[PDB]
Amino acid sequence: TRPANHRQLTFEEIAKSAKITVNEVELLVMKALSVGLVKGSIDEVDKRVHMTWVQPRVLDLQQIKGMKDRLEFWCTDVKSMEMLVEHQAHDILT
Amino acid sequence: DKKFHGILDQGEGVLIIFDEPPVDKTYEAALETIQNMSKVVDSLYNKAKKLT
Amino acid sequence: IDAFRLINANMMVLGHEPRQTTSNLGHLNKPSIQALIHGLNRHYYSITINYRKNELEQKMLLNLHKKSWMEGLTLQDYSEHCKHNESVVKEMLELAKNYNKAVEEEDKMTPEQLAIKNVGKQDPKRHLEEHVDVLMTSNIVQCLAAMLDTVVFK
Amino acid sequence: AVQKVVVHPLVLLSVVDHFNRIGKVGNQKRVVGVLLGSWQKKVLDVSNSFAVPFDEDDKDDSVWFLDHDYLENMYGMFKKVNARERIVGWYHTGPKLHKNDIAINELMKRYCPNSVLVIIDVKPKDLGLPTEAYISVEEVHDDGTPTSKTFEHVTSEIGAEEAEEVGVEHLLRDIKDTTVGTLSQRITNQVHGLKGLNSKLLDIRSYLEKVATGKLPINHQIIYQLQDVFNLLPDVSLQEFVKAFYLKTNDQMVVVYLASLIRSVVALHNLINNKIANRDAEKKEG
Amino acid sequence: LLKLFTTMELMRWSTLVEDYGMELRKGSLESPATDVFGSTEEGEKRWKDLKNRVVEHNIRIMAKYYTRITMKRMAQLLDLSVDESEAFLSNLVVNKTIFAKVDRLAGIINFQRPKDPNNLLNDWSQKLNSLMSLVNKTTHLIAKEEMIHNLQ
């Protein structure tokens, strides 16, 4: 859901969505880490779960559209500040 | 007497253990050259003073 | 590589290598001593070689033998880069102390003779700023590529 | 199982001239010939080749001619003059490849079992593309999918041995992209290293334009294989923050006090050595 | 033996004694189980040492999947006291076989280690180089492969 801007998920959100109790979420996330559909980690001083995730799936063409807009913002940032570098050091580039 | 890398607190009664940075060498070798470069400018200072 | 051509003995009363109205014979080689000891220049003669060299073969051999695309913005990151920043400065300190030695010496020992009798590819300018160039080129290209990757990637 | 192929630079080179051989009658826009090789390990090696008569029709794109008898005898020649070398595959050009290449490959896999093909790009030779090589495997397609061929890719490179760099270095002689670069050389590597970044990206731009817009049928494999790319780019944080200025400053210190000061004092030494030698020849003219 | 492989096979010693303790009592054949455990002092220390092996199996998987962990959660997950969990972990770290460190004024202990700016930047460049430039090289060539099959 959230595209790794704040992927530090709180434990209560798992206990709300999966409607499982608080004490089972650690065995729940160590299971999915064991199977290998996720490669995150667990903190417990905040009881928040960090997520580095590598199991992708189908993304339903209306969300290819939002994937296009990410790629274009990514596109124009590459092109613009390439032009800033070329115009800045044009005299010593040659 | 440097037998140990820690620190104490009177306000907490709490012993804290930390480590040491070993990356002193680059800045240390830098400022010794400034002592060398200070003498070579003094060498050029009286070289211009002895003859213009 | 060299190319040759067999000359007759019928022109023994005439000029062997019968060359004429041009001034590009004294180029490309003088007849070398290891080759004129054999049948040059009384059995065969040399002949000039240049290359039918063209575009679309020049550029495809240039650009395809020496190229690196994604390597142009790599890092070689810092565990050996910043280590190499120690690797030069240390003897550059001692070579600076050697640079101290000659400059505070400065004696009238006929100083145009004093400079020429101790050429050694050594201290005052040769073993100097050459290192300053290498410290400059390595650190700028490192740090400039570091700032761009922060710019480009989010 | 091929790691990478090694292109000896006589083979491509001996393709471009053969394209230029038929170019006086040129109406085919593709040249197919035989790729000799020397299989050593999971990495492959190519060092020789030759050509073969081939034609192809735009209509029905499945009537094509490799010449077996010409392939028999001339390979029998190159075996006789050099028994080190054998066949490893074939080549063609025209980067929009004809779909007939299933039939070309499945014929001459009876000469080499793990046959391999290399596409050279004679006319497109500009941005980032030396060559391209494919490998032939055939699954069905996937779990619940019909049958297919599906050419797969093995990465490529351009190799170098002694007594061809001798032929290379004697033939450049103009700019050569000289040995280990200066400041200007590294910055240009960052320029056209980045000019191809968006160039690959403008291609992946157009793909998910024309597949998501709604023209051609979607692959599923390439979609989620693109998805993990976007969930792998780093972000900025406080741990990135205090660390970056910890070691940018450490790179900076070497530049600042050790390179700028000492280069100035050397040039300051050239002041006094000039001005003494200037006026002492001036005052001692007469 | 399958359950003592790895990745916790999710386990707990209280569950382990109540499903396989019947295996240590009379059964069909059963006799090496009565031979190894169940004795007067030889099997009884081996009851203790099996407890030792399973709690040691539970420490290593915690070091895999936890940045931090409170002290009270480790006590209730190892089926033993807070003070025993202190000394059993303190034994393993002076033996330096599990690489951890505690803070017992607050009970919050940690398993991760302090990374270096030479190291964090090396991880920053590694995800950058290896799997944002190479996979971007990779996607482009399959993207050319789809133009083969789809048109015409």
mmCIF file of C-alpha atoms in Angstrom, chain D:
data_model
loop_
_atom_site.group_PDB
_atom_site.id
_atom_site.type_symbol
_atom_site.label_atom_id
_atom_site.label_comp_id
_atom_site.label_asym_id
_atom_site.label_seq_id
_atom_site.Cartn_x
_atom_site.Cartn_y
_atom_site.Cartn_z
ATOM 1 C CA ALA D 1 24.621 -22.519 -19.953
ATOM 2 C CA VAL D 2 26.661 -19.636 -21.368
ATOM 3 C CA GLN D 3 28.242 -16.988 -19.150
ATOM 4 C CA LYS D 4 29.181 -14.464 -21.844
ATOM 5 C CA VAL D 5 30.507 -14.463 -25.380
ATOM 6 C CA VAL D 6 33.811 -12.871 -26.328
ATOM 7 C CA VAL D 7 33.779 -10.972 -29.624
ATOM 8 C CA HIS D 8 37.191 -10.997 -31.336
ATOM 9 C CA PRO D 9 37.391 -7.878 -33.472
ATOM 10 C CA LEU D 10 37.899 -9.491 -36.839
ATOM 11 C CA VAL D 11 34.440 -11.097 -37.022
ATOM 12 C CA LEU D 12 32.156 -8.019 -36.746
ATOM 13 C CA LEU D 13 34.768 -6.307 -38.866
ATOM 14 C CA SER D 14 34.467 -9.190 -41.339
ATOM 15 C CA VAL D 15 30.704 -8.713 -41.353
ATOM 16 C CA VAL D 16 30.759 -5.008 -42.228
ATOM 17 C CA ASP D 17 32.877 -5.559 -45.331
ATOM 18 C CA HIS D 18 30.621 -8.389 -46.480
ATOM 19 C CA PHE D 19 27.630 -6.112 -46.047
ATOM 20 C CA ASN D 20 29.626 -3.719 -48.203
ATOM 21 C CA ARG D 21 30.369 -6.530 -50.696
ATOM 22 C CA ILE D 22 26.675 -7.063 -51.440
ATOM 23 C CA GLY D 23 25.961 -3.343 -50.979
ATOM 24 C CA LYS D 24 26.569 -2.599 -54.655
ATOM 25 C CA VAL D 25 23.541 -4.814 -55.370
ATOM 26 C CA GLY D 26 22.066 -4.146 -51.909
ATOM 27 C CA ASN D 27 18.361 -4.863 -51.637
ATOM 28 C CA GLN D 28 18.380 -7.502 -48.873
ATOM 29 C CA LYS D 29 19.083 -5.317 -45.746
ATOM 30 C CA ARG D 30 20.315 -8.433 -43.899
ATOM 31 C CA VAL D 31 23.475 -10.518 -44.143
ATOM 32 C CA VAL D 32 23.561 -14.048 -42.728
ATOM 33 C CA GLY D 33 26.797 -15.995 -42.398
ATOM 34 C CA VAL D 34 28.507 -18.644 -40.320
ATOM 35 C CA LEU D 35 30.142 -17.815 -36.986
ATOM 36 C CA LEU D 36 33.208 -19.904 -36.191
ATOM 37 C CA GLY D 37 34.094 -20.286 -32.552
ATOM 38 C CA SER D 38 36.276 -21.852 -29.908
ATOM 39 C CA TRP D 39 34.241 -23.184 -26.995
ATOM 40 C CA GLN D 40 36.374 -23.245 -23.851
ATOM 41 C CA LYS D 41 34.178 -22.918 -20.749
ATOM 42 C CA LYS D 42 30.805 -21.401 -19.791
ATOM 43 C CA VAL D 43 32.354 -18.256 -21.293
ATOM 44 C CA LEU D 44 32.411 -18.532 -25.106
ATOM 45 C CA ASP D 45 35.001 -17.340 -27.617
ATOM 46 C CA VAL D 46 34.684 -16.233 -31.255
ATOM 47 C CA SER D 47 37.657 -15.348 -33.442
ATOM 48 C CA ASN D 48 36.746 -16.184 -37.038
ATOM 49 C CA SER D 49 33.772 -16.247 -39.403
ATOM 50 C CA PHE D 50 32.683 -16.249 -43.021
ATOM 51 C CA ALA D 51 29.486 -15.694 -44.978
ATOM 52 C CA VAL D 52 27.017 -17.822 -46.929
ATOM 53 C CA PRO D 53 24.377 -17.071 -49.613
ATOM 54 C CA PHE D 54 21.031 -16.235 -48.037
ATOM 55 C CA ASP D 55 17.769 -14.736 -49.244
ATOM 56 C CA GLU D 56 14.464 -13.895 -47.618
ATOM 57 C CA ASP D 57 11.069 -12.722 -48.824
ATOM 58 C CA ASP D 58 8.971 -10.048 -47.132
ATOM 59 C CA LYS D 59 5.815 -11.956 -48.062
ATOM 60 C CA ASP D 60 5.045 -14.929 -45.729
ATOM 61 C CA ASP D 61 8.592 -14.464 -44.140
ATOM 62 C CA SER D 62 9.241 -18.212 -43.989
ATOM 63 C CA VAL D 63 10.956 -19.011 -47.307
ATOM 64 C CA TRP D 64 14.677 -18.801 -46.653
ATOM 65 C CA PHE D 65 17.949 -20.330 -47.802
ATOM 66 C CA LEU D 66 20.936 -21.390 -45.870
ATOM 67 C CA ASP D 67 23.257 -23.196 -48.243
ATOM 68 C CA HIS D 68 24.362 -26.468 -46.671
ATOM 69 C CA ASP D 69 26.833 -27.498 -49.384
ATOM 70 C CA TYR D 70 28.577 -24.124 -49.306
ATOM 71 C CA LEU D 71 28.633 -24.432 -45.515
ATOM 72 C CA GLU D 72 30.193 -27.896 -45.768
ATOM 73 C CA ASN D 73 33.110 -27.212 -48.082
ATOM 74 C CA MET D 74 34.289 -23.791 -46.925
ATOM 75 C CA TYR D 75 34.239 -24.930 -43.310
ATOM 76 C CA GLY D 76 36.220 -27.929 -44.540
ATOM 77 C CA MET D 77 38.731 -25.416 -45.872
ATOM 78 C CA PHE D 78 39.060 -23.464 -42.619
ATOM 79 C CA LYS D 79 39.364 -26.727 -40.711
ATOM 80 C CA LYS D 80 42.202 -27.801 -43.002
ATOM 81 C CA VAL D 81 44.193 -24.584 -42.640
ATOM 82 C CA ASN D 82 43.476 -24.362 -38.892
ATOM 83 C CA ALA D 83 42.223 -27.371 -36.931
ATOM 84 C CA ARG D 84 41.887 -25.276 -33.761
ATOM 85 C CA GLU D 85 38.679 -23.612 -34.945
ATOM 86 C CA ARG D 86 35.139 -24.954 -35.273
ATOM 87 C CA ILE D 87 31.623 -23.625 -35.755
ATOM 88 C CA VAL D 88 29.653 -22.225 -32.824
ATOM 89 C CA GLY D 89 26.795 -20.543 -34.678
ATOM 90 C CA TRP D 90 25.804 -17.728 -37.036
ATOM 91 C CA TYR D 91 25.123 -13.998 -37.307
ATOM 92 C CA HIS D 92 22.838 -11.427 -38.874
ATOM 93 C CA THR D 93 22.182 -7.683 -38.802
ATOM 94 C CA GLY D 94 19.135 -5.435 -39.087
ATOM 95 C CA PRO D 95 18.264 -5.006 -35.403
ATOM 96 C CA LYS D 96 14.531 -5.243 -36.007
ATOM 97 C CA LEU D 97 15.043 -8.976 -36.423
ATOM 98 C CA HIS D 98 12.847 -11.086 -38.658
ATOM 99 C CA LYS D 99 10.803 -13.696 -36.810
ATOM 100 C CA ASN D 100 12.170 -16.374 -39.167
ATOM 101 C CA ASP D 101 15.154 -16.799 -36.810
ATOM 102 C CA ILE D 102 13.461 -19.758 -35.139
ATOM 103 C CA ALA D 103 13.763 -21.634 -38.433
ATOM 104 C CA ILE D 104 17.350 -20.555 -39.173
ATOM 105 C CA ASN D 105 18.501 -21.607 -35.712
ATOM 106 C CA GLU D 106 16.649 -24.933 -35.510
ATOM 107 C CA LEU D 107 18.171 -25.964 -38.835
ATOM 108 C CA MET D 108 21.825 -25.448 -37.949
ATOM 109 C CA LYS D 109 21.589 -26.779 -34.421
ATOM 110 C CA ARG D 110 22.490 -30.066 -36.124
ATOM 111 C CA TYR D 111 25.974 -28.613 -36.593
ATOM 112 C CA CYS D 112 26.443 -27.392 -33.021
ATOM 113 C CA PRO D 113 24.139 -28.553 -30.187
ATOM 114 C CA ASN D 114 24.407 -25.414 -28.070
ATOM 115 C CA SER D 115 24.196 -23.117 -31.066
ATOM 116 C CA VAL D 116 24.374 -19.371 -30.493
ATOM 117 C CA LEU D 117 23.694 -16.288 -32.586
ATOM 118 C CA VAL D 118 25.084 -12.760 -32.460
ATOM 119 C CA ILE D 119 23.402 -9.681 -33.905
ATOM 120 C CA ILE D 120 25.756 -6.965 -35.046
ATOM 121 C CA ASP D 121 24.466 -3.468 -35.790
ATOM 122 C CA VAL D 122 26.284 -2.081 -38.816
ATOM 123 C CA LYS D 123 24.340 1.135 -39.402
ATOM 124 C CA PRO D 124 23.094 1.850 -35.804
ATOM 125 C CA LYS D 125 26.475 2.432 -34.219
ATOM 126 C CA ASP D 126 25.980 5.573 -32.181
ATOM 127 C CA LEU D 127 24.729 5.556 -28.576
ATOM 128 C CA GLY D 128 25.383 2.454 -26.489
ATOM 129 C CA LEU D 129 25.161 -0.663 -28.639
ATOM 130 C CA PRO D 130 28.207 -2.737 -29.638
ATOM 131 C CA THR D 131 26.372 -5.997 -30.524
ATOM 132 C CA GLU D 132 23.802 -8.378 -29.059
ATOM 133 C CA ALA D 133 23.749 -12.161 -28.654
ATOM 134 C CA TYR D 134 20.900 -14.587 -28.013
ATOM 135 C CA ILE D 135 20.678 -18.129 -26.689
ATOM 136 C CA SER D 136 18.072 -20.704 -27.693
ATOM 137 C CA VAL D 137 16.060 -22.510 -25.028
ATOM 138 C CA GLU D 138 12.469 -23.742 -25.328
ATOM 139 C CA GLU D 139 10.088 -24.164 -22.421
ATOM 140 C CA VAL D 140 6.361 -24.354 -23.114
ATOM 141 C CA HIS D 141 6.075 -20.759 -22.131
ATOM 142 C CA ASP D 142 5.172 -20.691 -18.433
ATOM 143 C CA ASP D 143 2.889 -22.687 -16.118
ATOM 144 C CA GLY D 144 -0.546 -22.285 -17.739
ATOM 145 C CA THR D 145 0.452 -20.955 -21.151
ATOM 146 C CA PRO D 146 0.708 -22.407 -24.692
ATOM 147 C CA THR D 147 3.923 -23.430 -26.418
ATOM 148 C CA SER D 148 6.533 -20.945 -27.627
ATOM 149 C CA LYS D 149 10.161 -20.669 -28.674
ATOM 150 C CA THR D 150 11.394 -17.658 -26.616
ATOM 151 C CA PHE D 151 14.947 -16.733 -27.555
ATOM 152 C CA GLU D 152 16.831 -15.836 -24.387
ATOM 153 C CA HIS D 153 19.736 -13.456 -23.958
ATOM 154 C CA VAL D 154 23.327 -13.990 -22.874
ATOM 155 C CA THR D 155 25.404 -10.875 -22.185
ATOM 156 C CA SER D 156 28.230 -10.001 -24.551
ATOM 157 C CA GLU D 157 31.562 -8.215 -24.626
ATOM 158 C CA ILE D 158 34.359 -7.311 -27.015
ATOM 159 C CA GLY D 159 37.566 -9.213 -26.364
ATOM 160 C CA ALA D 160 41.241 -8.514 -26.898
ATOM 161 C CA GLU D 161 44.324 -10.675 -27.314
ATOM 162 C CA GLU D 162 47.853 -9.813 -28.305
ATOM 163 C CA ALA D 163 48.563 -9.285 -32.012
ATOM 164 C CA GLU D 164 45.229 -7.756 -32.542
ATOM 165 C CA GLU D 165 45.709 -4.799 -30.198
ATOM 166 C CA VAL D 166 48.845 -4.333 -32.273
ATOM 167 C CA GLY D 167 46.482 -4.066 -35.218
ATOM 168 C CA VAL D 168 44.146 -1.884 -33.177
ATOM 169 C CA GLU D 169 46.623 0.625 -31.729
ATOM 170 C CA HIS D 170 48.325 1.145 -35.077
ATOM 171 C CA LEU D 171 44.975 1.903 -36.722
ATOM 172 C CA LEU D 172 43.534 4.485 -34.330
ATOM 173 C CA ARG D 173 46.261 7.187 -34.390
ATOM 174 C CA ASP D 174 43.843 10.150 -34.057
ATOM 175 C CA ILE D 175 42.436 10.716 -30.536
ATOM 176 C CA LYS D 176 42.456 7.079 -29.303
ATOM 177 C CA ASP D 177 40.596 7.880 -26.033
ATOM 178 C CA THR D 178 44.046 8.178 -24.425
ATOM 179 C CA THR D 179 45.310 6.293 -21.363
ATOM 180 C CA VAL D 180 44.267 6.828 -17.826
ATOM 181 C CA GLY D 181 42.132 9.866 -18.018
ATOM 182 C CA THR D 182 42.379 13.438 -16.845
ATOM 183 C CA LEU D 183 39.674 15.558 -15.248
ATOM 184 C CA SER D 184 38.046 16.208 -18.614
ATOM 185 C CA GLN D 185 38.074 12.518 -19.515
ATOM 186 C CA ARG D 186 36.263 11.379 -16.374
ATOM 187 C CA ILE D 187 33.582 14.056 -16.615
ATOM 188 C CA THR D 188 32.739 13.027 -20.185
ATOM 189 C CA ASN D 189 32.414 9.469 -18.876
ATOM 190 C CA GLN D 190 29.852 10.863 -16.460
ATOM 191 C CA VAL D 191 28.162 12.787 -19.269
ATOM 192 C CA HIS D 192 27.642 10.071 -21.873
ATOM 193 C CA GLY D 193 27.347 7.535 -19.100
ATOM 194 C CA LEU D 194 24.278 9.513 -18.095
ATOM 195 C CA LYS D 195 23.128 10.314 -21.635
ATOM 196 C CA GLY D 196 22.455 6.608 -22.009
ATOM 197 C CA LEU D 197 20.681 6.412 -18.644
ATOM 198 C CA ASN D 198 17.624 8.221 -19.927
ATOM 199 C CA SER D 199 18.156 6.555 -23.330
ATOM 200 C CA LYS D 200 17.510 3.142 -21.799
ATOM 201 C CA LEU D 201 14.789 4.839 -19.772
ATOM 202 C CA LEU D 202 13.131 6.447 -22.812
ATOM 203 C CA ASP D 203 12.888 2.945 -24.245
ATOM 204 C CA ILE D 204 11.269 1.577 -21.100
ATOM 205 C CA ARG D 205 9.205 4.772 -21.214
ATOM 206 C CA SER D 206 7.718 3.829 -24.570
ATOM 207 C CA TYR D 207 7.125 0.173 -23.684
ATOM 208 C CA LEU D 208 4.744 0.761 -20.782
ATOM 209 C CA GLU D 209 3.229 3.563 -22.792
ATOM 210 C CA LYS D 210 2.230 1.291 -25.665
ATOM 211 C CA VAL D 211 1.358 -1.753 -23.521
ATOM 212 C CA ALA D 212 -0.560 0.107 -20.808
ATOM 213 C CA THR D 213 -2.186 2.501 -23.250
ATOM 214 C CA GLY D 214 -3.753 -0.573 -24.785
ATOM 215 C CA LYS D 215 -2.187 -1.789 -27.987
ATOM 216 C CA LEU D 216 -0.202 -4.972 -27.706
ATOM 217 C CA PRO D 217 -0.889 -7.935 -25.367
ATOM 218 C CA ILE D 218 0.754 -7.619 -21.977
ATOM 219 C CA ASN D 219 3.548 -9.834 -20.854
ATOM 220 C CA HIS D 220 3.221 -10.691 -17.203
ATOM 221 C CA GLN D 221 6.879 -11.578 -16.603
ATOM 222 C CA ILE D 222 8.298 -8.132 -17.413
ATOM 223 C CA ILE D 223 5.743 -6.306 -15.254
ATOM 224 C CA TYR D 224 6.624 -7.518 -11.777
ATOM 225 C CA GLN D 225 10.269 -7.798 -12.819
ATOM 226 C CA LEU D 226 9.970 -4.044 -13.340
ATOM 227 C CA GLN D 227 8.074 -3.616 -10.072
ATOM 228 C CA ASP D 228 10.904 -4.514 -7.691
ATOM 229 C CA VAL D 229 13.119 -1.874 -9.330
ATOM 230 C CA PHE D 230 10.908 0.901 -7.990
ATOM 231 C CA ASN D 231 10.863 -0.741 -4.564
ATOM 232 C CA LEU D 232 14.636 -0.856 -4.440
ATOM 233 C CA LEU D 233 15.802 2.735 -4.914
ATOM 234 C CA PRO D 234 17.294 4.408 -1.830
ATOM 235 C CA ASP D 235 15.782 7.414 -0.128
ATOM 236 C CA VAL D 236 17.141 10.226 1.967
ATOM 237 C CA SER D 237 17.115 9.897 5.750
ATOM 238 C CA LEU D 238 18.981 11.121 8.802
ATOM 239 C CA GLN D 239 21.336 8.149 8.578
ATOM 240 C CA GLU D 240 22.097 9.092 4.992
ATOM 241 C CA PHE D 241 22.385 12.728 6.100
ATOM 242 C CA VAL D 242 24.982 12.711 8.887
ATOM 243 C CA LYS D 243 27.010 10.042 7.094
ATOM 244 C CA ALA D 244 27.264 11.916 3.786
ATOM 245 C CA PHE D 245 28.677 15.063 5.356
ATOM 246 C CA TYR D 246 30.909 12.875 7.511
ATOM 247 C CA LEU D 247 32.778 11.587 4.475
ATOM 248 C CA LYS D 248 32.262 14.402 1.981
ATOM 249 C CA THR D 249 34.162 16.583 4.459
ATOM 250 C CA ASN D 250 36.779 13.844 4.787
ATOM 251 C CA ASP D 251 37.197 13.782 1.009
ATOM 252 C CA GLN D 252 37.212 17.580 1.069
ATOM 253 C CA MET D 253 40.049 18.012 3.597
ATOM 254 C CA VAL D 254 42.520 16.220 1.306
ATOM 255 C CA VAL D 255 41.686 18.628 -1.518
ATOM 256 C CA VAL D 256 41.646 21.816 0.524
ATOM 257 C CA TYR D 257 44.727 22.070 2.671
ATOM 258 C CA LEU D 258 47.015 19.554 1.052
ATOM 259 C CA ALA D 259 46.484 20.180 -2.638
ATOM 260 C CA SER D 260 45.577 23.867 -2.883
ATOM 261 C CA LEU D 261 48.238 25.142 -0.483
ATOM 262 C CA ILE D 262 51.169 23.132 -1.788
ATOM 263 C CA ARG D 263 50.424 23.853 -5.456
ATOM 264 C CA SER D 264 50.326 27.556 -4.589
ATOM 265 C CA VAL D 265 53.684 27.511 -2.786
ATOM 266 C CA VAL D 266 55.334 25.753 -5.738
ATOM 267 C CA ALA D 267 53.995 28.469 -8.024
ATOM 268 C CA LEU D 268 55.097 30.976 -5.408
ATOM 269 C CA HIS D 269 58.575 29.452 -5.626
ATOM 270 C CA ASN D 270 58.476 30.117 -9.365
ATOM 271 C CA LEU D 271 57.827 33.798 -8.615
ATOM 272 C CA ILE D 272 61.086 34.438 -6.764
ATOM 273 C CA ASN D 273 63.146 32.195 -9.049
ATOM 274 C CA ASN D 274 61.859 34.173 -12.015
ATOM 275 C CA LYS D 275 62.200 37.655 -10.526
ATOM 276 C CA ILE D 276 65.745 37.061 -9.288
ATOM 277 C CA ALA D 277 66.814 35.640 -12.647
ATOM 278 C CA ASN D 278 64.960 38.415 -14.471
ATOM 279 C CA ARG D 279 66.534 41.488 -12.893
ATOM 280 C CA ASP D 280 69.987 39.983 -12.381
ATOM 281 C CA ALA D 281 70.193 39.606 -16.146
ATOM 282 C CA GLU D 282 68.681 43.076 -16.469
ATOM 283 C CA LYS D 283 71.099 44.931 -14.173
ATOM 284 C CA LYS D 284 74.043 43.015 -15.672
ATOM 285 C CA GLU D 285 73.375 43.711 -19.345
ATOM 286 C CA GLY D 286 75.754 46.671 -19.306
#
